[PDB]
């Protein structure tokens, strides 16, 4: 609510790649999360400036299936507010979740997507993607990277949809240990 808006303002940035504009969610220290299909390079445009990526980790499950989550370790002095304590340890169903992003098409957007349910593996644009949470909301192109959350629970980043539902990549605390 207030929590989600403060999260966007404090930890989120516009990342621009050849795939367009995405929301980038800082997690802790210099480590941020972006959708894997943003295809970030060795340096990324953040809030209109080139930022060098010290290390990139494309996260996979134990069968090497994409989670659609990529970790960026950024060459910056700033430290993200450590939000790991709000990131769940396991996949679970959540009620009254919001999608929030800040992007040219969707500036300071916050919308209620409702209930978020663990949904498993889905092929997104031909690529198998695991550990997705699904919400019955007609999410739109340009909302990728948006945060799926509510007060105290930071649960996914938005990574796809089909015009009727949205798929979020589950954020799990062990990713960020």
Curated annotation (Swiss-Prot):
Domain Peptidase C3 span(s) in chain numbering: 1-176
Enzyme active site: 37 (for protease 3c activity), 68 (for protease 3c activity), 144 (for protease 3c activity)
Subcellular location: Host cytoplasm
Domain of life: Viruses
Catalytic activity: Selective cleavage of Gln-|-Gly bond in the poliovirus polyprotein. In other picornavirus reactions Glu may be substituted for Gln, and Ser or Thr for Gly
Function: Major viral protease that mediates proteolytic processing of the polyprotein. Cleaves host EIF5B, contributing to host translation shutoff. Also cleaves host PABPC1, contributing to host translation shutoff.
This protein's name: Protease 3C
Protein's organism: Human rhinovirus C (strain C15)
Residues of the full protein shown: 1514 to 1690 of 2153
């Amino acid at each position: 609510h207030e929590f989600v808006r403060a999260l966007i303002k404090r930890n989120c940035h516009v990342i621009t790649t050849s795939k367009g504009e995405f929301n980038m969610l800082g997690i802790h220290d210099n480590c941020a999360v972006v959708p894997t299909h943003a295809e970030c390079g060795d340096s990324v445009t953040i809030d209109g400036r080139e930022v060098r990526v010290l290390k990139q980790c494309i996260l996979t499950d134990t069968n090497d299936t994409d989670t659609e989550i990529t970790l960026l370790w950024l060459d910056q002095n700033e430290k993200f507010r450590d939000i790991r304590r709000f990131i769940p340890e396991h996949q679970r169903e959540w009620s009254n979740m919001h999608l929030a992003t800040n992007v040219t098409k969707f500036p300071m957007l916050d919308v209620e997507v409702g209930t978020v349910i663990p949904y498993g593996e889905v092929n997104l644009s031909g690529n198998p993607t695991c550990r997705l949470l699904k919400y019955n909301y007609p999410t739109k192109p340009g909302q990728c990277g948006g945060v799926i959350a509510n007060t105290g629970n930071i649960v996914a980043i938005h990574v796809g949809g089909n015009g009727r539902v949205g798929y979020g990549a589950a954020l799990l605390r062990k990713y960020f240990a």
